[PDB]
């Protein structure tokens, strides 16, 4: 339709804290990031998403802030992050920023100032509700686990913590509060970011009666009342008009459990909202009715029509991103591919999919490098306010714990923010001292060295995705259409844009399939522009290849 | 702010039912409207809004409507309507419709082919879900809940009004997008505006939560409801000429402005039920209380300060389902002519869009039916039965029906002093008011000093100047529990609006300074006091 820069952008996300560590304290720094910064531009990134960089007590590393002004102390200092800004400026190359804005600190001055009193201002700046019946107001749960309200005696009445118990949520239903949001991000955006990542933006809003949860229980979802809310969209046109619309930026946003068409409301064009959104749709294909716990085996057709159904959806007026791994969220050459058996072949299939279809690519630290989940021995091993609070509360109930820990080592977050495994020699070379998790043992095997070595690697092969990616219109803004969709093996669509053309045939499993081509889809011209090995209907193992038709 | 002819305009509420009747059936018909129609003109009456006039069971009288696109069959053919829109346009005039889309009929096309089965188009059409006993402990707005059940499906249907007003599911496309179509279609033939029947209850929040009681919190100001009306204004309002006012139940004058606003390019105007709240207490509209003019000088001014910059108030103080003012906020009985004549006054010398319901210009009063059976309402009739029930005193019951009662406003105008004051030549589906003999159309079109004609001189001015249509509001003696007076104000030109909320001193402020009195009207024809008087005085 039309077009921008981040349309035809590929953004790298960066866990700060195992990233680099330039101080040896364990916990990665922004300097460390400025000392790697060449990795990044060899790969062809073009821009860069630091995860929450601002001052936070470190319950769930950094969405809880204290202070928005202020570059948190592990990290480094507020130049060493201009530093980070001017060498990408400087590089040809952009930074997003982490806006985590509906829940702050229990230490922010506001909540400090919220629960003084019933009559200071600061207390409609969070959700403070009474007790129904001598216990919480609603039947809504935190997210890590158990209410989403905690008691405070100095005011006797609860407030909303639909996440940690230090993650108080804010009343968005307040121009105080929406005013200041905005404040805050002049005041990042006056210094020249280019660009925004909204955290749980759609639960900015809670429906006004604050009510409890249909189908009962113990503790259940209140997400028919705070996600998708009904001022959302209220408050983004605001946002927009009165921020980011004075700012060249990009603008995408973490929307869980959003449908397709009310993404639209998000990422239309003429919404004037956001310009992109997360849509944690194609992360529930292997989880399943329970929670993200419940594991389950998974329908490549249905897989590849959540894929198919977003890209056709938003195709016209709209953005895709394109995302199969981020820090809430396992590694894919795992998850949706085999990290035992075909791990290199697996990455570069899967990566040519975020990179063949029509969207904003996104990379996760270590995608490049085909990173694996991590199965440490002991639950100790792991530092997450969910996996430890998972854990606590399944076993309170009696749950076996072998049951428990499975679920822990294929859906935990703390699978992704392992130190990353740059070198083969103590920790990855991330942390001279001891990583504030433990690093994969896999480094000796899994590094960028080798990467950067080996003309064959998973670095090599994104690095070309993105190079063809920056090379042909095509896979930018190309149309979509999928072909053998039915075909449970074989994940093949086509994109085309005016005469061009371009065939993605992927193989989703380890076994040499049947590439039956339809005639629909005619060819005199056979040009493949990359494949994983360098009519031969046999197929490799995990294997995908861009034929462009032409 | 910006100009329009909406602005300053007077809309003239038609009750079809009971405003004349050329058919000796009782029932009100629209050729009756056209003969009628002199007399509106002479009072100065800009726009005129007929309440719902389609195909219908009459089971809400008009609010269930069973064909969108057929005129309904006691009132006349399109022809008799066709004409009526002529003849307005041909004296200047305008129409309105009534846009009851929240809520179809049991006897459309649509539920009849709903209820079918679980697999037609049409299942989706309204609100079927299953039951938890029933989906949840919402209640309906007469009496009961909000679901009724069927075994041909073994499930419940919304039914926030009545169980022949099955509310429509506004998250289908193929709901709104018939719902445009029915619009243009009235809106191809040149009707000038669209009043909009619960807007702000057209969507409901998606999880159809529990709360018998109120379900308000979801189905009321929900979800998607600016979403739709950008979309309707976007898709049919925006391609015509025309006026918009919406039925939106409990608003709050900040929800009105993301309905009224300039730039949000949805409604041009909203009717907030606020002020109809202020005699109404926690337990109900029945639960009639005593009444502060603080606080009604409170809600009547917090909203015109509040839209006034951006935005357009509505001004109206008895509507077909709301209790008659002159008895409500006056003496029906020691000063009819002046709780009338003050009681216009405001809702002429405040800033928004003036509505006259029917016979307000003739200050006719509510009605005191000995029996229930002299009632037809199925608000009224249902509460009864349900109060009966719990065993309520029907004493208590009628002192309800007799104050917050809608067939209060429904009685067959009085035009003059003969049978059913010159309405029906029959008998009328409600009994009349006897105080035709006293309250009526001639009397007032002869006496000169009449409600009538002061309504008329309110109109007029209002045309005369401009301060009245446009100018800013500003009120003084705030405080004072007798006296509700304020100023409007536009460019040099000032107004003081002096008025007396009760029978019974003037201390006027300096900050309210004036070198030149110049009484633009007067309840009666310095500082000074009088019974329910009302002056506008212009200080210039």
Redesign the interface.
């Known amino acids: 339709m039309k077009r921008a820069w981040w349309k035809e952008s590929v953004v790298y996300q960066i866990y700060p804290r195992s990233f680099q560590d330039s101080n040896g304290d364990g916990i990665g720094d922004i300097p460390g990031i400025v000392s790697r910064l060449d990795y990044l531009q060899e790969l062809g990134v073009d821009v860069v998403w630091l995860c929450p960089v601002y001052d936070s007590p470190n319950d769930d590393n950094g969405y809880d802030i204290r202070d928005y002004r202020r570059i948190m102390d592990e990290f480094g200092t507020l130049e060493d992050w201009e530093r980070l800004l001017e060498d990408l400026h400087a590089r040809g190359m952009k930074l997003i920023m982490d806006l985590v804005v509906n829940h702050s600190s229990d230490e922010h001055a506001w909540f400090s100032e919220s629960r003084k009193s019933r009559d200071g201002e600061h207390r409609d700046y969070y959700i403070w509700r009474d007790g129904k019946g001598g216990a919480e107001p609603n039947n809504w749960s935190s997210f890590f686990s158990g209410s989403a309200w905690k008691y405070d005696g100095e005011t006797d009445q609860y407030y909303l913590h639909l996440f940690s118990s230090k993650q108080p949520d804010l009343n968005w239903e307040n121009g105080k509060v929406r005013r200041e949001v905005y404040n805050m991000m002049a005041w990042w955006l006056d210094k020249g970011i280019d660009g925004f990542r909204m955290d749980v933006i759609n639960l900015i809003s809670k429906?006004?009666?604050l009510?409890?949860a249909?189908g009962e229980g113990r503790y259940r979802s209140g997400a028919?009342?705070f996600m998708?809310?009904?001022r959302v969209?209220?408050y983004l046109q605001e946002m927009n008009r009165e921020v980011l619309s004075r700012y060249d930026i990009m603008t995408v946003g973490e929307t869980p459990g959003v449908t397709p068409e009310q993404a639209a409301?998000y990422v239309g064009e003429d919404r004037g909202e956001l310009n992109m959104v997360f849509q944690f749709e194609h992360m529930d294909i292997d989880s399943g009715p329970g929670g993200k716990w419940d594991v389950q085996p998974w329908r490549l057709t249905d897989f590849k029509r959540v894929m198919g159904k977003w890209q056709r959806e938003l195709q016209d007026r709209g953005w895709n991103s394109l995302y199969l791994n981020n820090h809430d969220q396992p590694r894919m050459v795992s998850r949706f591919g085999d990290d035992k058996n075909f791990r290199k072949q697996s990455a570069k299939m899967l990566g040519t999919l975020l990179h063949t279809l029509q969207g904003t690519p996104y990379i996760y630290q270590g995608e490049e490098l085909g990173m694996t989940n991590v199965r440490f021995g002991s639950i100790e091993d792991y530092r997450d306010i969910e996996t430890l609070n998972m854990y606590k509360e399944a076993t309170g109930a009696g749950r076996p714990a072998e049951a428990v820990m499975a679920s822990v080592y294929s859906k935990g977050r703390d699978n992704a923010r392992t130190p990353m495994q740059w070198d083969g020699s103590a920790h990855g070379g991330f942390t001279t001292g001891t990583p504030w998790i433990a690093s994969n043992p896999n480094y000796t095997e899994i590094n960028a060295e080798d990467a950067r070595r080996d003309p064959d690697s998973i670095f090599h092969y994104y690095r070309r995705l993105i190079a063809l990616r920056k090379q042909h219109d095509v896979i930018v803004y190309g149309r979509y259409e999928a072909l053998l969709e039915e075909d449970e093996r074989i994940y093949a669509y086509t994109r085309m844009l005016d005469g061009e053309r371009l065939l993605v045939v992927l193989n989703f499993f380890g076994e040499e399939a049947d590439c039956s081509l339809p005639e629909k889809i005619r060819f005199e011209s056979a040009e493949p522009l990359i494949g994983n090995y360098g009519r031969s209907l046999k197929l490799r193992p995990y294997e995908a290849l861009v034929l462009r038709l032409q």
């Open positions: 429906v006004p009666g009510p409890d249909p028919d009342y998708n809310g009904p969209h209220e409301l």
